[PDB]
Amino acid sequence: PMFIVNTNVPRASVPDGFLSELTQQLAQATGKPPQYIAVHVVPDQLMAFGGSSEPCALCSLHSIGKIGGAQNRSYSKLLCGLLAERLRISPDRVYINYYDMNAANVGWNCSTFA
Amino acid sequence: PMFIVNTNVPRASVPDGFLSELTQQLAQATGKPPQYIAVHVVPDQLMAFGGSSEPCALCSLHSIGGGAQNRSYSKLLCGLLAERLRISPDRVYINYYDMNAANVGWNCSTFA
Amino acid sequence: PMFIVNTNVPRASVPDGFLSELTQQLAQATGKPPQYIAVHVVPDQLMAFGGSSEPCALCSLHSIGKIGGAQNRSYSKLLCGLLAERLRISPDRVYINYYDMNAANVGWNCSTFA
Ligand SMILES: [Cl-]
Ligand SMILES: [Cl-]
Ligand SMILES: [Cl-]
Numbered sequence: 001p002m003f004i005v006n007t008n009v010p011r012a013s014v015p016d017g018f019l020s021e022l023t024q025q026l027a028q029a030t031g032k033p034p035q036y037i038a039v040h041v042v043p044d045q046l047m048a049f050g051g052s053s054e055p056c057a058l059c060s061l062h063s064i065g066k067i068g069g070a071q072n073r074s075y076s077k078l079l080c081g082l083l084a085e086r087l088r089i090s091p092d093r094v095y096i097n098y099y100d101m102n103a104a105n106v107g108w109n110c111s112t113f114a
Numbered sequence: 115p116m117f118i119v120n121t122n123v124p125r126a127s128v129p130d131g132f133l134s135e136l137t138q139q140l141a142q143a144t145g146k147p148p149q150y151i152a153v154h155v156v157p158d159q160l161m162a163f164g165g166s167s168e169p170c171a172l173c174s175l176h177s178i179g180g181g182a183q184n185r186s187y188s189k190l191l192c193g194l195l196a197e198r199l200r201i202s203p204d205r206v207y208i209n210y211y212d213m214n215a216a217n218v219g220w221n222c223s224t225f226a
Numbered sequence: 227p228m229f230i231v232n233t234n235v236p237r238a239s240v241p242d243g244f245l246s247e248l249t250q251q252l253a254q255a256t257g258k259p260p261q262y263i264a265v266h267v268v269p270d271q272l273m274a275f276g277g278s279s280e281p282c283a284l285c286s287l288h289s290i291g292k293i294g295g296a297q298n299r300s301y302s303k304l305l306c307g308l309l310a311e312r313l314r315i316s317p318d319r320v321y322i323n324y325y326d327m328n329a330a331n332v333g334w335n336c337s338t339f340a
Contacts, residue, residue: 080222092223110306111318192336204337
């Protein structure tokens with residue numbers, strides 16, 4: 001799957017190993033190898049919830065088919081605390097959205113060429 | 115509603131108070147209280163279109179639940195975007211998306 | 227057409243005239259004039275991909291028209307080398323996905339309203 005984190009928290013505040021930690025956590029929850037897991041953390045964003053520019057994060061999880069619904073709740077219970085504590089963000093200012101990816105959409109590896 | 119602005123304008127020249135201003139404008143346009151509004155501005159992008167790397171902004175509004183609506187939204191937001199970010203109006207675009215109720219945003223306050 | 231490049235490569239590491247070059251390559255690839263090409267490079271992301279935080283580029287091309295394998299292949303042949311060489315990324319860490327744009331999704335220009 002692909003986990004994306006948009007946040008207004010400064011780049012320097014993102015702890016070292018946080019990417020590896022997210023990857024390991026997703027790999028733990030899914031039983032899927034770290035090899036096919038992708039994670040994007042985008043800091044230094046200009047964001048506001050309700051006009052408030054306090055530390056916050058809008059996150060999106062993209063997986064094949066639909067390992068969600070209740071697994072959405074599961075994923076939330078798995079990721080929310082980690083995000084909130086690592087990024088110094090209040091839990092009520094972290095949002096996670098879940099999307100279904102199209103399995104038939106083929107990603108092209110450039111090593112076949114170039 | 116969530117409003118996203120992708121721009122190649124440097125973060126420093128994004129006016130202080132622009133997020134609040136955008137929030138209130140969206141509150142008027144959508145008719146929803148600011149608490150339900152999220153604004154996401156992405157500066158310092160490398161962007162080009164129309165054969166030019168001049169200042170520009172590609173924006174998107176995502177909300178739960180029409181062309182007329184999109185038009186009125188554009189009328190309400192365009193001037194603010196163009197003037198505040200110092201971008202020529204013809205280099206500001208806005209797309210509108212109806213958000214699928216399955217699924218919306220899950221807040222983490224309930225969980226850990 | 228709209229080409230998006232998500233990369234962990236620093237913004238300062240992106241060579242002068244890269245957007246112009248990409249625009250020309252994309253216009254040759256899509257057979258549309260350069261003026262119709264849109265390019266969005268999103269650098270300085272914190273990306274782990276395949277369990278690695280080494281330089282990488284996850285790209286997407288959005289264009290109106292049916293998604294075809296041969297066309298995607300030709301696109302990749304045209305784009306991969308340019309991306310890898312210009313951004314100094316290993317070709318096996320550059321990926322391109324191809325998406326069919328919804329023609330009924332109208333982009334509103336603000337010159338009409340400002
Ligand atoms: Cl502000
Ligand atoms: Cl009409
Ligand atoms: Cl070919």
